[PDB]
């Protein structure tokens, strides 16, 4: 009846340190569709996050993209938080820059 | 465009 | 070639959160090009591709006074559907929508649909003759002799092959310059190792439109499906989409794998391997 968030975690382009980007987080084949999802850098969260408008797959599971503008660089890290009625906490995803 | 609705 | 049009309402009840909540999404193919949210500040159908926007406001509004109208049955039939399921009303709801139809290359209607679910499982369906129903369980019964009693099935029917089929290409038209054109796949093969005897080769395919996309890794011009480990297409967030296929390898048998690309894009398939040598 209930399944939980299926998470990715990746840039729109390929990475280039230095070099502006979009980190995405895509959610999919979940339900139900109340789901919060936010982009870390650093394990604090970005603010300035937007998300696709709530759609779902011919199984009925939903999906929404969420992504924020962001320059992939030596040092910081970048992750993806998720909270779902089906986690007890908050799963997080770091973003790898080979997936 | 969007159809019509029917209730259930 | 063929393409689709297709529509996803989401009516959402949400007890001591206020009245119900409708959200309606479309697509053509994989584009969405109007959206809709009881919530947010506007109340009318968005545009959210740009050739639609040159509509006219006569459009427009005719679209909003339906998401309007779907607005107000929302409470409606999550109300009958917690009837029909004899269910109190505490709990939170979801009924959902999905009406579309497909052409053929030539334009004519292979198929249309216009099916519900009630919170995640299946609730009704028009079946493919377009004249009769199916109904999930008992209670959804009660929707179909409903709709039977009531020619439902007819003016759903009369909206498949007439409404739908002809606006589905006029969206294709005026979307002409990106909704018709297909941009292969970029691909490319890297190396990880896993250990001192396995590494991992992973096939990329980026950027391409429309989302189906195949790959597949041959060992020795083996389909390899059981180690191949798919991530499950998704967005770039521009329009295109990405997606990767991953196998483990003896190390040293890297050059006994291929992996193949197929995509609409690609009138003869891509077929590569992993390079590292020199």
Not at chain 1, 22 to 43: A, Q, R, T
Not at chain 3, 90 to 112: E, F, K
Not at chain 3, 243 to 259: D, I
Request: charged share 25%.
């Amino acid at each position: 009846i209930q399944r939980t968030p299926k998470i990715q975690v990746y840039s729109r382009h390929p990475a280039e340190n230095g070099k502006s980007n979009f980190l995405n987080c895509y959610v999919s084949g979940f339900h139900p569709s109340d789901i919060e999802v936010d982009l870390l850098k650093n394990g604090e969260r970005i603010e300035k996050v937007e998300h696709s408008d709530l759609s779902f797959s011919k199984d009925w599971s939903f999906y929404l993209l969420y992504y924020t503008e962001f320059t992939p660089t030596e040092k910081d890290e970048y992750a993806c938080r998720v909270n779902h009625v089906t986690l007890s906490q908050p799963k997080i995803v770091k973003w790898d820059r080979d997936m | 465009t969007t159809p019509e609705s029917a209730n259930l | 070639g063929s393409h689709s049009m297709k529509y996803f309402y989401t009516s959402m009840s949400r007890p001591g959160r206020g009245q119900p909540r409708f959200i309606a999404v479309g697509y053509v193919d994989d584009t969405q090009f109007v959206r809709f949210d009881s919530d947010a500040a506007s109340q009318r159908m968005e545009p959210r591709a740009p050739w639609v926007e040159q509509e006219g406001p006569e459009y427009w509004d005719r679209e909003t006074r339906n998401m309007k109208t779907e607005t107000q049955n929302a409470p409606v039939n999550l109300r009958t559907l917690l009837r029909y399921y004899n269910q109190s009303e505490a709990g939170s709801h979801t009924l959902q929508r999905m009406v579309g139809c497909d052409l053929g290359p030539d334009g004519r209607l292979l198929r249309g649909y216009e099916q519900y679910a009630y919170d995640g499982k299946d609730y009704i369906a028009l079946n493919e003759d377009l004249r009769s129903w199916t109904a999930a369980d008992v209670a959804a019964q009660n929707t179909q002799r409903k709709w039977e009693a009531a020619d439902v099935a007819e003016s759903m029917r009369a909206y498949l092959e007439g409404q739908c089929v002809e606006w589905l290409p006029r969206y294709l038209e005026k979307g002409k310059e990106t909704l018709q054109r297909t941009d292969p796949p970029k691909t490319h093969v890297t190396h990880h190792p896993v250990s001192d005897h396995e590494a991992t080769l992973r096939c990329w395919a980026l950027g391409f439109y429309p989302a189906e996309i195949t790959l597949t890794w041959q060992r020795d011009g083996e389909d390899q499906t059981q180690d191949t480990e798919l991530v499950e297409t998704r967005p770039a967030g521009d329009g295109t989409f990405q997606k990767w296929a991953a196998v483990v390898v003896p190390s040293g048998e890297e050059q006994r794998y291929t992996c193949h690309v197929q995509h609409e894009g690609l009138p003869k398939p891509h077929t590569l391997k992993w390079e590292p040598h020199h």
